[PDB]
């Protein structure tokens with residue numbers, strides 16, 4: 387396996403090259419007013435964030451009745467924007483059968499437009515649909531999912547029609563907990579996220595989902611397919627993608643309760659890394675992402691919980707029964723942020739021959755950062771190639787974060803005397819190489835994605851499926867097809883694939899695991915091919931499976947084209 391870095395070629399994801407740290411290196415908190423958390427944020431260069439508080443928790447606190455809103459103290463001064471996501475629990479205190487949805491929406495706009503400081507993102511209800519059958523709701527099931535979507539729609543409509551908020555606050559939804567698009571032969575997609583996009587999507591600035599590994603893995607090809615489907619349908623519906631927001635990502639350890647444990651609760655860090663590389667490659671269509679690691683989470687530390695900390699906590703009190711006076715310990719989740727500290731700059735060109743080895747590279751003035759992650763279940767040796775034999779690179783330091791499920795995190799920083807010829811990387815290990823670079827850019831390469839008017843197509847044995855694409859700027863560089871399929875695990879993953887009539891090789895491998903422990907495979911399989919097969923303008927992809935069943939969920943062409951600028 388090989389990875390190649392060209393630090394003399396600047397890389398763009400459509401219009402952006404620079405890494406936006408604020409899209410990634412965040413905690414699931416807004417506790418920057420805590421002395422310990424605030425110091426951590428500065429020390430590790432971390433942003434915010436997410437909070438369960440908003441117009442509906444504020445209003446209920448005043449009126450003690452769902453769907454009834456107080457008067458907001460009038461305020462007509464400047465509105466500043468704090469970068470975080472405000473969300474609400476999908477409680478009966480916030481939404482209920484019989485609610486006046488237009489009044490609820492009006493209230494969000496009244497609450498925020500009379501505030502001196504608003505969140506950059508409002509995500510009205512957290513994981514709403516999984517709560518649609520909760521006993522306390524007087525409307526349940528599909529009717530409640532529809533009411534929750536109408537609540538979202540009203541909020542987006544009212545916020546956007548308020549000139550004090552429009553352009554300042556972005557409304558995102560639906561904070562999806564369980565992005566099992568494929569369930570029920572894609573009935574789940576049709577009745578959850580498709581329905582959301584159809585019924586509230588016009589009023590949303592972007593679409594939000596939660597991405598978790600069980601410790602059943604979404605990292606790798608499943609999460610890629612999950613997010614590609616949202617983009618692919620948004621293109622069809624709106625004529626363009628809308629940005630994504632990954633309002634939680636991490637791991638869930640499968641534990642009889644949600645209490646923190648020093649070994650089990652750090653297993654999530656490997657998931658942070660595995661998802662991060664996916665999301666870095668989406669920066670041009672990503673508002674924000676939030677690693678699911680929080681703060682002191684003092685709300686959890688109660689008699690009823692035996693004074694345990696919450697699993698997602700970042701700080702653990704030395705004395706849980708004296709919270710007023712206790713010292714607080716920063717746990718080993720800190721090493722996720724240590725690994726990525728100072729990493730920034732313009733993307734530079736990088737490729738990896740093995741889809742299980744995720745690669746990133748950035749150049750910030752005289753510093754070069756090269757990152758690798760192993761999604762496979764075996765160690766892999768990766769040959770590192772550079773066309774200039776690294777002549778301009780010196781003072782190499784290797785950072786390594788290895789998550790072992792029994793031993794916890796092993797984090798090391800080592801000076802090495804030259805860029806390595808090859809690197810061995812074990813499962814759940816992420817490496818960041820930091821070096822000085824003295825070089826200037828002689829070329830750029832621009833990654834664009836092209837979406838089809840066709841999506842969600844049922845597969846029949848021997849029956850070709852045609853996917854048209856338009857507006858392609860072809861040229862020199864690289865290209866690939868992102869082919870997402872949901873099929874029984876035994877169904878073929880090796881269709882015949884033709885690019886403008888020319889058959890191309892379909893790889894055996896894809897990002898991450900085989901999903902053998904799932905009944906339905908739902909994943910994006912990349913099919914690299916020669917860019918020279920693409921034409922300027924219209925292109926067609928035709929694919930044929932030898933067996934029936936399942937669907938092609940989305941087909942997206944990725945083109946990385948050499949460009950001046």
Ligand SMILES: *[C@@]1(O[C@@H]2[C@@H](O)[C@@H](O)O[C@H](CO)[C@@H]2O)O[C@@H](COS(=O)(=O)O)[C@@H](O[C@@H]2O[C@H](CO)[C@H](O)[C@H](O[C@@H]3O[C@H]4CO[C@@H]([C@@H]3O)[C@@H]4O[C@@H]3O[C@H](CO)[C@H](O)[C@H](O[C@@H]4O[C@@H](COS(=O)(=O)O)[C@@H](O)[C@@H](O)[C@@H]4O)[C@H]3O)[C@H]2O)[C@@H](O)[C@@H]1O
Pocket residue numbers: 414415437438439443444445447448512513563596634637638678680681683685696698699
């Ligand atoms: C979610 O869980 C995840 C799922 O979404 C999903 O993805 O699966 C995941 C598996 O990994 C997971 O289950 O996120 C969690 C986040 O954890 S955290 O980041 O560690 O916190 C949990 O969310 C937490 O849920 C708890 C309850 O279970 C709680 O709601 C947490 O938030 C806290 O709530 C209270 C207590 O501490 C503060 C936290 O935000 C907050 O304090 C309130 O703050 C407001 C101001 O913002 C007020 O001060 C309020 O005081 C009251 O109101 C004031 C007046 O205020 S106002 O004028 O109305 O504005 C006064 O009247 C005062 O007297 C009064 O007491 C104060 O309480 C939350 O983060 C999971 O539960 C969640 O599902």
Ligand SMILES: [Ca+2]
Pocket residue numbers: 741742762895896897898899900
């Ligand atoms: Ca693989």
Ligand SMILES: [Cl-]
Pocket residue numbers: 515516564
């Ligand atoms: Cl659901």
Ligand SMILES: [K+]
Pocket residue numbers: 468503504505
């Ligand atoms: K605020």
Ligand SMILES: [K+]
Pocket residue numbers: 515562563564565566578
């Ligand atoms: K969902």
